[PDB]
Design a binder for this molecule. Sequence first.
Ligand SMILES: COc1cc2sc(C(=O)CCC(=O)O)cc2cc1/C=C\COc1cc2cc(C(=O)CCC(=O)O)sc2cc1OC
Lengths: 177, 177
Amino acid sequence: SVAHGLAWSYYIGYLRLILPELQARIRTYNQHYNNLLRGAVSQRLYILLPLDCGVPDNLSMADPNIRFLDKLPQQTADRAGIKDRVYSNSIYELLENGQRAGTCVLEYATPLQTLFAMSQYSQAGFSREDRLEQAKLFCQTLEDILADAPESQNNCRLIAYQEPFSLSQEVLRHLRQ
Amino acid sequence: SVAHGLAWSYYIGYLRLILPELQARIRTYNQHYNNLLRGAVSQRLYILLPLDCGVPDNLSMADPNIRFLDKLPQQTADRAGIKDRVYSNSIYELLENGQRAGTCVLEYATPLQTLFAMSQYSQAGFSREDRLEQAKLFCQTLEDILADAPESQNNCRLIAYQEPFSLSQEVLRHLRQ
Ligand SMILES: COc1cc2sc(C(=O)CCC(=O)O)cc2cc1/C=C\COc1cc2cc(C(=O)CCC(=O)O)sc2cc1OC
């Protein structure tokens, strides 16, 4: 299926390449700013999986309690002819009653955006019904892959959600565990 | 199918975002070094499509007449929560009898690498026969998309090839047109 390929590709072509080097980048940033307790960036990459496929580019739009703090120092790697291909990742603070309750690297799984866009292109032969079905399958497949993945054990968290409570509280729910 | 999704995703999630800004980046680099004639970087992104799905990270390995010249100045854009997500691209010189015959931005379509890797993972339920079939379908679909794509008219060239003459000569064949 479309989702099956997208999930395997997002894993092989992205997660597999950034997750083994993420914890060393996170440890470097926390040790540079002596970040302890709530101000210490979580050791895991938090991946937003909206089932509606609505992927905005600014996280401070889906929820105001998600605020950009810093960029995680870039990772570079020679990739498919691109010398020093850059892997940029953003660190966010999660607010609760105005104060910083948690700190983590956060981003959306960009294949969910593709699925929505695909449903808008006549040439794609892909319906809105296909988009919701493939969205659920993409999440389930990514979950199945990461469950067995050696690169991505204790350094990745999937956050699947359906808008009917709070995204910030949901990230914080995972962060507090 | 797996290829159909991969081609639409590579287009929507990558080509659609870098191709409208590529020619301005190319024009900036050529004007910075007063590059004219053979030393002038081609206005198109050259995408390598090996039908065997063999995607190495160093182009100077598939053919020695492909030599790294410079990095095209990075493009940055806020993308799915990643602030200033970096789009790095590499400029290559194409050699003929030791001398520079052409200059172009060159890279492999990374979804072809995913397809090969997918065929190696037992959980993917994807055979070597599926990999070759999906590889051909990925190329054909990408060609179909780019043919009608408004972002990607005169600024993208697909180079599909099957190893049985010369990759460098093949890129040069397109460059000389
Ligand atoms: C959303 O879908 C894509 C997005 C990108 S972005 C990308 C490149 O930047 C080219 C170089 C590279 O692969 O690193 C290739 C792809 C390919 C696809 C197509 C299928 C999805 O599989 C991938 C996801 C994927 C996401 C990538 C990211 O960098 C995450 C951030 C973002 O998408 O902007 S790399 C990447 C590679 C994938 O397959 C090779």
